[PDB]
Amino acid sequence: LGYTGLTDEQAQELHSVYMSGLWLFSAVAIVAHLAVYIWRPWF
Amino acid sequence: LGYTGLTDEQAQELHSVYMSGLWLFSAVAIVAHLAVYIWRPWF
Amino acid sequence: LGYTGLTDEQAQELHSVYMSGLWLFSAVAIVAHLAVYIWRPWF
Amino acid sequence: LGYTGLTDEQAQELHSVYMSGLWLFSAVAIVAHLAVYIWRPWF
Amino acid sequence: LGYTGLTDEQAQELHSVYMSGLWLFSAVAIVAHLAVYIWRPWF
Amino acid sequence: AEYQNIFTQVQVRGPADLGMTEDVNLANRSGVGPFSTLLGWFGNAQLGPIYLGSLGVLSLFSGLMWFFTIGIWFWYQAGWNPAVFLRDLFFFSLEPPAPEYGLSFAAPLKEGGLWLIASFFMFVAVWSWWGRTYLRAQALGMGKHTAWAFLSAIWLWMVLGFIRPILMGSWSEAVPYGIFSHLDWTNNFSLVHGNLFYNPFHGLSIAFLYGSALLFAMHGATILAVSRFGGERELEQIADRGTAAERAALFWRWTMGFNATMEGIHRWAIWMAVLVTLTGGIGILLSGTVVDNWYVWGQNHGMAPL
Amino acid sequence: ALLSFERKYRVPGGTLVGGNLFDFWVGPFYVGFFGVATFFFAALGIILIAWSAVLQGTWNPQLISVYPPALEYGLGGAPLAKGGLWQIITICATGAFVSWALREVEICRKLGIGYHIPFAFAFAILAYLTLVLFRPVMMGAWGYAFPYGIWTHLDWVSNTGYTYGNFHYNPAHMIAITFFFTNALALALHGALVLSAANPEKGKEMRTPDHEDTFFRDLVGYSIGTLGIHRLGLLLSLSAVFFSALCMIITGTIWFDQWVDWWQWWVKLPWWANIPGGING
Amino acid sequence: MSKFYKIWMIFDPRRVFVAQGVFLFLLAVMIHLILLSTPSYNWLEISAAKYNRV
Amino acid sequence: MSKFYKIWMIFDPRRVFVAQGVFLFLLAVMIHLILLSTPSYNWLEISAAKYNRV
Amino acid sequence: MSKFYKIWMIFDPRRVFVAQGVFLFLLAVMIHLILLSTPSYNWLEISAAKYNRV
Amino acid sequence: MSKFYKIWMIFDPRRVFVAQGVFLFLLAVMIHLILLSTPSYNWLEISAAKYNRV
Amino acid sequence: MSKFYKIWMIFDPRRVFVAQGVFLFLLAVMIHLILLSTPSYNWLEISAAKYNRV
Amino acid sequence: MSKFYKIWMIFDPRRVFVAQGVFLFLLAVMIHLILLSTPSYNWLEISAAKYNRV
Amino acid sequence: MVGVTAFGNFDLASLAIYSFWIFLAGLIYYLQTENMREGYPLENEDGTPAANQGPFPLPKPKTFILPHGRGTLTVPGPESEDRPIALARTAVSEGFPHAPTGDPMKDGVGPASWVARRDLPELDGHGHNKIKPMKAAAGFYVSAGKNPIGLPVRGCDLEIAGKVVDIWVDIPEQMARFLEVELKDGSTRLLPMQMVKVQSNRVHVNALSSDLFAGIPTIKSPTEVTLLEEDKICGYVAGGLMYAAPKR
Ligand code: BCL
Ligand SMILES: CC[C@H]1c2cc3[nH]c4c(c3C)C(=O)[C@H](C(=O)OC)c4c3nc(cc4[nH]c(cc(n2)[C@@H]1C)c(C(C)=O)c4C)[C@@H](C)[C@@H]3CCC(=O)OC/C=C(\C)CCC[C@H](C)CCC[C@H](C)CCCC(C)C
Ligand SMILES: CC[C@H]1c2cc3[nH]c4c(c3C)C(=O)[C@H](C(=O)OC)c4c3nc(cc4[nH]c(cc(n2)[C@@H]1C)c(C(C)=O)c4C)[C@@H](C)[C@@H]3CCC(=O)OC/C=C(\C)CCC[C@H](C)CCC[C@H](C)CCCC(C)C
Ligand SMILES: COC1=C(OC)C(=O)C(C/C=C(\C)CC/C=C(\C)CC/C=C(\C)CC/C=C(/C)CC/C=C(\C)CC/C=C(\C)CC/C=C(\C)CC/C=C(\C)CC/C=C(\C)CCC=C(C)C)=C(C)C1=O
Ligand SMILES: COC(C)(C)C/C=C/C(C)=C/C=C/C(C)=C/C=C/C(C)=C/C=C/C=C(C)/C=C/C=C(\C)CC/C=C(\C)CCC=C(C)C
Ligand SMILES: COC(C)(C)C/C=C/C(C)=C/C=C/C(C)=C/C=C/C(C)=C/C=C/C=C(C)/C=C/C=C(\C)CC/C=C(\C)CCC=C(C)C
Ligand SMILES: COC(C)(C)C/C=C/C(C)=C/C=C/C(C)=C/C=C/C(C)=C/C=C/C=C(C)/C=C/C=C(\C)CC/C=C(\C)CCC=C(C)C
Ligand SMILES: COC(C)(C)C/C=C/C(C)=C/C=C/C(C)=C/C=C/C(C)=C/C=C/C=C(C)/C=C/C=C(\C)CC/C=C(\C)CCC=C(C)C
Ligand SMILES: COC(C)(C)C/C=C/C(C)=C/C=C/C(C)=C/C=C/C(C)=C/C=C\C=C(C)\C=C\C=C(/C)CC/C=C(\C)CCC=C(C)C
Ligand SMILES: CCCCCCCCCCCCO[C@@H]1O[C@H](CO)[C@@H](O[C@H]2O[C@H](CO)[C@@H](O)[C@H](O)[C@H]2O)[C@H](O)[C@H]1O
Ligand SMILES: [Fe+3]
User: Fold this and answer.
1) Backbone angles phi, psi at N164, to 5 degrees
2) Max alpha carbon distance in chain M (Å)?
3) Distance, CA of G205 to CA of M43 (rounded, Å)
4) How close G175 comes to chain N (CA, Å)?
5) How far is the C-alpha of G80 from the C-alpha of G91, rounded, in Å?
6) Which of G8, G240, I27, N84 is deepest in the core (most CB within 10 A)?
7) Which residue of J has its CA nearest to E43?
8) C residues 1-43 near L, CB within 8 Å?
9) Which of J42, J47, J53 to mutate to test the interface with E (most CBs of E within 10 A)?
10) CATH of the domain at E37
11) Looking at residue M28, which CATH number applies to its domain?
């Protein structure tokens, strides 16, 4: 499985940091989407 | 057989994770399709 | 991991300097954005 | 013996799983065709 | 002759199952042809 | 005189080379064909074997159907007269359906449906041939560079015949299957869209076509100029750099100020060649769908006086 | 600075003119007698193009143009503002190109290699002279040449190509286009094949000229060989340029009407000229 | 008509099966397209007219 | 026909699977395209006109 | 007449069979299209006119 | 249909995951674009018209 | 979802990260350009109209 | 969030730094030019009209 | 037609053209870096690394695996001309020719330069000598053209230097690479065929004078030739165009 040299243990923290970044990105995206939808909706 | 170099257990667990992701994507797809259909049905 | 051949403390220090520079850049950006928004808002 | 270097038992298992997939796909196709033909027949 | 050298029993079973499939295909095609002609004949 | 190494002055012939086999299925392989002395004065005089797999035979069959369909329609246009067929051969055309049919398949066979059938044949043939090139690279363990280089020209072809007609909403936009019919299609395409010269991607495509000619003149002349040091054996000059590679590098180092390597010049070559069809496909795609008058567009974007 | 292997080649000799007066390198560039000549001509041409820009009143790089003299001047001189700057820049460009080719000849001699490169460049130079010297003089006017602008020289191309109908029916044009297109195809194939052999599937051994011969025999049933492919590339490019200069040396000098009518001679062959049926029957 | 089986001893099964599949697919597509070409047999347009569709 | 399985011993399963997947995708998109082109079965315009959107 | 077995002692059965199959298919499709060209033998046209489908 | 895990004994996860990511993204973009082309589904224009944004 | 981290035993993290970055930036600029093209969502033109700037 | 420094264990810092520099510069130039295109936000023209320099 | 502009005159075509400018800049950067795997870093004329190395950084190393266990070649990497380069710089400043100190045709400098390639034969895909003499090859014969065996060889001074004995051919290419030439002393020298003008009655050589064929480097084996020997022979033969010039 470790085709990339990862040892299944630092992949856990790699995924944790990546999900932290992904969720911060999605939180800011949701804030922006809500602000625009209040500004003017599309549905 | 085994051209992928994976044992049965690795294949089963990988398939379980992949099906978890596939069902999540399908559920989001159903939700989006339902919202679009109630907003402006194509039938 | 270990692709880049860097230790954890070197990465820590490099990220510390980088975050200092990033926050300085973003602070100047915020000041400029606020100044123009006061001068001519886009909302 | 053959060409692909496989046996008959694994061939039987592969045929079984492929036939299950084919029947599922064809059944979903049949359901879709019924739904459309009720919605808008082509005869 | 014997470019492949397949044992005569193997060729016999191969031809038998191939002709089984061919007869199945020709039967389905015959049914479809009859249906098409009855719906809208060309003769 | 002084020999220039443009023609082989002595030919040598030996055993038929059947090639190597990394993962090659020997069964599909053909047998060595004849030997061409005339063609051997320029290169390898051996012909064959030819590999005929499953995508290969699919491509052969579909291409046979496409070419034969065009031929039968050409015979129909001839009145089945062989003399006319050899007189009006260039002027024949299997034209697409007229615009009032749009993208519909409900066109009469004599009125563009046959064009749809032949287009399906050629589509299948070319895509199976791309799969063929990829698989033949796969069997010998080689890189898939030829497959992607082919995909560039395939994309230009798909834009001309498939993607742009779909976007424009009519098969009438596509190129006919004729000799002068497709020349006329080209000239009329330029005239309708207002001087395709001012298409920036047409200009880029011409830049890379001129660059392909310039680069192959340069590379061929360079390799022939250092062929006296075994410059032809480019792979070994990559693995074990000789005086040929160094002299070739230094010629352009002293001429231009920069140079390539024996391996990277072929990266230059492949990219210079594939950018031709990449930019050309982009430019054709933008024509009509986005810009209908390229000279007015040019005026609005510099490129032309107001 | 030098490459890691350059020093053993930086030796005197091979210069046609001079021999030690202009036998040195500025950076990587080899400066010779012709290096000096080509630098002078190129610098003059660039400065004069910029000067013609300020005379034109534009600084848009894509709008700068330097037009040749009008048809009224024939094959004579012209004021700098009218067509004289174009004539001087044509002098400078011809000198720069010729000096570049001769400087390449000197570099070839110093490296002990063949002279294929300057010869192949002389082909391009003669195509350029066909467009700016041979065709205008055979026609009698410098105004039949093209302007030195990025998009105005395309205007020259379009107007000339439509002075004779659809230029696609010029047959020398047809063979030149076939050569250009097959040269691009050959370049793509050669680059791809060499890169595929030098770069295997993944983490496995480099391939051999036999392997690439094998690939192209398994693809199209043939291979031209590594010497043959470079021969073919040089031939395709040079012949494309040759038949380009050929299609534009017979155009407006031998043929004057719409080129499409040329293809009438074949359809009016007496045996099948008057058969009913077909496109032209 | 009881002796054809030995052709499988002169023909590679993979090659012949692929050839048959390709041939049948191409022929079926061509015939379906010809039927769509003829205005008397295009089932989409026939049902459009019979059911009074655009 | 109860013995259709042993065809897997003739053709490589990966070959068959990838080829049939490509074929299924191509056939599905082609049929969708034919239906989209015809005015009778172009569902977008059907929902535009029927719901009086156009 | 009853001696044509000696052609296959020199010709390759595989090449002969594939070539003759391709030739027969090409001849058949050429003739079918020829008949479809002539309005006096276009069976789809003839049936359309007989049953008043246009 | 709960015993499909055997796919990973045939197809490399590396190939299928990247190929399907590209496939799904391209199809999603294509469908979104088709909807954007049809005036009945250009949601930007529907929202512009419904809320008097002209 | 408790085993999604195995994606880093799937693909090289650098490749996934760079592909994600290019993908997301292209999508973001594409969406912003689409909004800017439509007059109803061009915030510059909207803010000009609200304040009578032009 | 705290352990974002781990980013420097995946990519060479020089490549990231040069990519960030060119990306930021191109984005900033693009946005400045977008604002210049719109007459609403062309500060040069705002200063021209506000102080009657035309 | 989507002719709508997001801002200014920036339509979809403008987006396409600027995207291509960005992509072309990236591609030119990539292509230039891929071409800096030989001869780098740059060095001063005394062999030390130079102050300037160019705006383009060196690329990451890449490893080629030679087919027959010949080893893994990593490029870029450390480089050295592992041979006695015998030249003296004519000027103290950079950018001037280095004069040969001795006989350049023998020292292997200038147009006579050679590279210290591997001293092993060239192996084909079958693991055999790619090039071998006509006799060593099995079945190879002159299929067409003049047969240059037994013909006199005439140097640039118009005096015979020897006679052609055998042709060395390429196994996977079927190309005639080398001519074997015997001089007055009965020894054999190899000549690349790209330098010989095979006429009807003679095989002329414009590169070398008659009293230089003995100066051609020899071969450790009479049937196998290594890359080092091929490079030495070719460099020496091509050096005669400049150095054997004064003797017509
Ligand atoms: C009056 C006409 C217009 C003009 C109208 C067009 C149109 C229309 C097009 C071009 C295109 C191009 N133009 Mg223009 N062009 C003009 C003037 C020029 C001039 C000039 C000096 O005046 C030049 C040098 C060019 C040059 C070019 C090329 C750079 C480019 C073609 C790329 C190519 O090689 O496709 C050739 C390769 C293919 C078309 C794909 C072929 C590959 C596929 C896979 C084929 C499969 C083969 C099949 C399986 C078997 C083959 C059959 C057998 C061999 C028998 N044009 C004038 C202004 N030009 C093309 C383009 O893309 O530019 C935007 C294009 O569509
Ligand atoms: C980078 C862009 C350039 C380019 C590149 C390019 N072209 C390519 C490739 C590449 C990288 C390939 O790999 C591919 C190839 O295979 O090259 C040899 C190809 C190719 N480019 C070709 C042509 C081509 N390329 C062109 C252009 C260009 N190609 C660009 C300039 C053009 C032009 C200018 O119009 C043409 C005409 C083909 C030679 C080939 C693709 C061949 C292919 O797909 O064939 C499919 C077959 C058919 C549709 C018809 C076959 C007709 C036969 C008569 C069928 C019957 C055969 C018979 C039964 C054989 C019997 C044999 C036995 C007796 C042994
Ligand atoms: C003959 C086959 C093809 C070919 C081959 C070829 N070209 C060559 C060579 C070869 C073998 C070289 O050795 C030589 C070289 O060094 O290449 C890098 C070269 C070269 N081909 C070049 C360009 C080039 N080749 C082209 C075409 C071709 N070159 C053919 C298709 C084109 C086209 C089709 O447009 C161009 C633009 C250069 C990169 C280079 C020669 C450089 C040179 O001439 O150096 C001296 C001059 C300068 C550095 C600048 C001179 C500037 C002038 C004094 C002023 C401008 C005058 C000009 C008329 C302006 C016109 C502008 C408008 C038309 C837009
Ligand atoms: C396998 O084999 C091979 C290789 O590899 C082994 C190769 O690589 C290549 C080569 C191929 C490539 C590298 C691929 C890329 C190439 C192309 C895409 C082809 C097109 C190339 C270009 C457009 C590149 C640029 C070309 C040109 C013509 C620019 C040339 C530069 C000049 C004009 C400078 C010329 C300088 C001269 C002559 C010196 C003059 C000196 C004096 C008068 C006195 C001193 C003057 C000064 C001090 C002035 C300042 C300094 C100077 C001279 C220069 C700097 C300053 C300037 C103002 C310019 C091939 C073919 C190959 O097959
Ligand atoms: C025409 O149709 C249009 C275009 C109009 C509409 C179509 C829209 C479509 C097709 C949209 C598709 C959208 C999709 C698929 C979006 C997917 C978005 C995702 C998955 C975004 C993920 C983002 C993840 C982020 C931003 C993660 C960031 C992480 C960091 C910033 C921290 C970096 C941490 C690292 C590298 C870990 C280091 C740790 C160790 C131990 C080394
Ligand atoms: C012209 O035709 C039009 C376009 C008009 C209409 C035609 C439409 C057609 C033909 C549509 C066809 C659509 C199809 C076939 C769609 C299929 C979509 C599928 C199958 C999507 C599947 C998605 C599955 C996903 C995204 C699964 C993701 C899984 C994860 C993210 C889990 C993470 C995986 C890990 C961690 C690997 C585990 C590894 C170990 C070692 C445990
Ligand atoms: C222009 O003409 C038109 C288009 C209008 C009309 C033409 C119509 C035509 C020509 C239609 C042709 C239709 C045909 C030939 C359809 C054939 C469809 C088939 C055969 C579909 C088969 C689907 C099979 C599936 C989906 C199988 C799935 C199997 C699995 C998911 C099991 C997975 C297990 C694997 C992959 C191997 C693991 C097993 C082991 C033991 C390791
Ligand atoms: C425009 O011009 C038109 C077309 C209007 C008029 C022109 C017409 C022309 C020129 C027509 C030409 C017609 C010709 C030359 C027709 C020739 C027809 C022949 C010779 C047909 C022969 C067919 C033979 C067949 C179909 C045999 C099939 C055999 C099998 C299917 C059995 C498979 C073989 C096995 C099992 C061999 C087993 C033995 C072993 C040892 C394995
Ligand atoms: C004696 O002669 C016989 C009868 C034996 C054979 C002779 C045949 C002859 C003389 C053939 C002549 C052929 C010629 C001159 C062909 C010329 C072809 C040319 C110049 C083509 C140029 C451009 C063609 C293009 C760009 C075609 C592009 C096609 C596509 C990209 C695929 C199109 C796919 C479509 C339209 C959709 C397909 C899908 C369905 C469902 C129909
Ligand atoms: C070249 C590589 C780097 C590209 C730059 C990096 C950012 C990439 C996106 C930038 C796109 C915007 O780029 C900018 O577009 C606007 C669109 O009106 C152009 O627009 C300007 O010139 C045009 C043409 O003369 C005028 O008609 C117009 O009134 C004026 O606004 C600018 O001349 C251009 O600089
Ligand atoms: Fe090469």
Assistant:
1) -75, 135
2) 57
3) 62
4) 30
5) 13
6) G240
7) J47
8) 3, 40-43
9) J47
10) 1.20.5.250
11) 4.10.220.20
Tokens (6 digits) for E11: 């060729």
How was this model experimentally determined? cryo-EM
CA–CA gap between residue G19 and residue G14 (Å, rounded): 8
Phi, psi of N33 (to 5 degrees): -65, -40
Partnered with residue F29 across adjacent β-strands are F51
Whether domain N104-244 has CATH 3.40.50.970: the reply is: no
CA distance G136 to G143: 7
Q: Could you tell me if the CB of G217 is within 6 A of ligand 2? A: no
Rounded to the nearest 10°, the torsion over CA G262, G264, G267, G273 is -140
Specify the residue for token string 């043929």: G255
Torsions phi, psi for L49 (to 5 deg):
-70, -40
CATH 1.10.340.30 for domain G1-163, yes or no, is: no
Phi and psi angles of residue N165, each rounded to the nearest 5 degrees, phi first: -115, -50
> Which atom of ligand 6 lies at the shortest distance from residue I25's CA?
10
Are M40 and L17 a contacting pair at CB < 8 A?
Answer: no
What ligand is nearest to the CA atom of residue E2?
8
Chains L, M: CB contacts under 8 A, how many? Answer: 18
Residue in the structure block whose two tokens are 């500060």? M43
- Give DSSP secondary structure letters for F56-109: HHHHHHHHHHHHHHHHHHHHHHTTT-HHHHHHSTTT--BPPPPGGGTT-S---G
Resolution in A for the shown PDB structure? 2.8
Question: In the numeric block, which tokens belong to residue F78?
Answer: 């001839």
Query: Hey, what amino acid is at I31?
Result: I
Q: How far does residue G261's CA lie from ligand 2's centre (Å)? A: 31
Q: Which contiguous run of DSSP H or E holds residue G192?
A: helix G171-198
Q: How many separate domains does chain D show?
A: 1
Q: Determine the structural domain holding residue K16 and report its residue range.
A: 5-51
Nearest CA in chain L to N4: L37
Backbone angles phi, psi at N144, to 5 degrees: -160, 165
Which amino acid belongs to residue J34?
I
Helices (H) and strands (E) in chain G, counts: 9, 2
- Most L CBs within 10 A among K44, K51, K52, hence the mutation to make, goes to K44
Asked whether the CA dihedral F280, F283, F287, F292 is positive or negative, the reply is negative
| Contact indicator for G196, F145 with CB cutoff of 8 Å | yes
- Secondary-structure percent of chain N, ordered helix, strand, coil, rounded to 5: 25, 25, 50
Where are the domains positioned within chain G?
A: 1-163, 164-263
Architecture (CATH level 2) of domain G164-263 = Up-down Bundle (1.20)
Q: Quick one: which of F206, F160, F157 has its CA closest to F186?
A: F160
For residues F249 and F260, what is the distance between their CA atoms, to the nearest angstrom?
6
With contact defined as beta carbons under 8 Å apart, do J18 and J11 qualify?
Answer: no
Question: Mutual orientation of helices H13-37 and F54-77 as an angle, nearest 10°?
Answer: 40
Nearest CA to ligand 2 atom 59: F60
